[PDB]
Amino acid sequence: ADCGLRPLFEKKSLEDKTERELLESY
Amino acid sequence: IVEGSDAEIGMSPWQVMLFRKSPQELLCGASLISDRWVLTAAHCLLYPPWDKNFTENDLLVRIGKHSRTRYERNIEKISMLEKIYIHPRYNWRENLDRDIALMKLKKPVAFSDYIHPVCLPDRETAASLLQAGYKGRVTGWGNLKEGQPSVLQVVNLPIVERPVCKDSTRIRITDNMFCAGYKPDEGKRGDACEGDSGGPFVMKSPFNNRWYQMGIVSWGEGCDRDGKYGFYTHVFRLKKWIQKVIDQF
Amino acid sequence: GDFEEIP
Ligand SMILES: *[B]([O])([O])[C]([C][C][C][C][C][N])[N]C(=O)[C]1[C][C][C]N1C(=O)[C]([C]C1=[C][C]=[C][C]=[C]1)[N]C([C])=O
Known part of the structure; x- marks a missing residue:
């Protein structure tokens, strides 16, 4: 459904301060 | 941490606080997966070795929380449990194998900006x-x-x-x-x-x-x-x- | 105790 999509983040196309750290480790 | x-x-927005009534304190962390279900460690509720045996009538769930100690007035959502389900095979005995439990809210929660699955x-x-x-x-x-x-x-x-x-x-x-x-x-x-x-x-x-x-x-x-x-x-x-x-x- | 009373 809509799980895992933060209203104030993913929805707003705003990234959080360390998430990029994840995506980079992949 | x-x-x-x-x-x-x-x-x-999925982080949830397991909070006990009497006495009022923090038990554990949990997670929102749907509007009425919450995930958590089974040991948060059952650990015979420490005489831990919580039951729905001893628990409340707090969703939408940022602040640990305070009552986040128009943000957070407090809810009562209808029933607790523990992996029938939870191994409290040896190595906390199958340390998972699901909790059912007496009433579902309306999602928002701070509360989300x-x-x-x-x-x-x-x-x-x-x-x-x-x-x-x-x-x-x-x-x-x-x-x-x-x-x-x-x-x-x-x-x-x-x-x-x-x-x-x-x-x-x-x-x-x-x-x-x-x-x-x-x-x-x-x-x-x-x-x-x-x-x-x-x-x-x-x-x-x-x-x-x-x-x-x-x-x-x-x-x-x-x-x-x-x-x-x-x-x-x-x-x-x-x-x-x-x-x- | 360190916690704020709830309704
Ligand atoms: B949880 O908050 O309830 C907690 C998580 C913190 C551990 C993080 C470290 N990386 N888990 C526990 O408190 C669990 C449940 C009861 C004891 N326990 C432990 O982690 C034990 C080690 C243990 C015991 C029995 C089976 C597996 C592992 N830790 C200590 C110091 O006793």
Whole structure:
């Protein structure tokens, strides 16, 4: 459904301060 | 969390606080998966060894929380439980194998900006992501060092290979278990600590940009320690139990 | 105790 999509983040196309750290480790 | 960092507002709208009535205090962390269901460590509710045996009529769930101690007035949501379901095979006895429980809210919750469900993995997401060297995020209001934070803490730990995990403890590790942390010789550090249990271990799919809960803060022998790691319930593996109790009730 | 009373 809509799980895992933060209203104030993913929805707003705003990234959080360390998430990029994840995506980079992949 | 240890060597963590304050969480940005609405960073984990799924983090939930397990709070007891009498006496009013923090028991554990949990997660919102749907509007009436909450995930957590079974040990948050049942640990005979410490005479821990909580029942719905002893619990309340607090969703939408940022601040640990205060009553976040127009944000947070308090809810009562209808019923607790514990993996019938939860091994409190030896090594907290199957440390998972589901809780049912007497009434569902309206979602918002601070309250939102996390995704449960799927066979492929887990195969792609549950890879050694990859990172996940952990949240919780637990001890700050092996102490209590004012706000929710956060940290990013890589997945440690099975062997390594195995070679770090005297406990007996199972397949429904994974470990995470930096290897002592890597500069960086951080861990999960006491109070963080039932707490989620998420990851972001590079495919659909969704966040998935991969683990549940389960156990560990001391907080942030070299040559030691954190252990989390492997949620995909217990996935099939989840659905079951969800399809029945 | 360190906690704020709830309704
Ligand atoms: B949780 O907050 O309730 C907590 C998570 C913190 C551990 C993080 C470190 N990486 N888990 C626990 O407190 C669990 C449940 C009861 C004991 N326990 C432990 O982690 C034990 C080790 C243990 C015991 C039995 C079976 C497996 C592992 N830790 C200590 C110091 O006793």
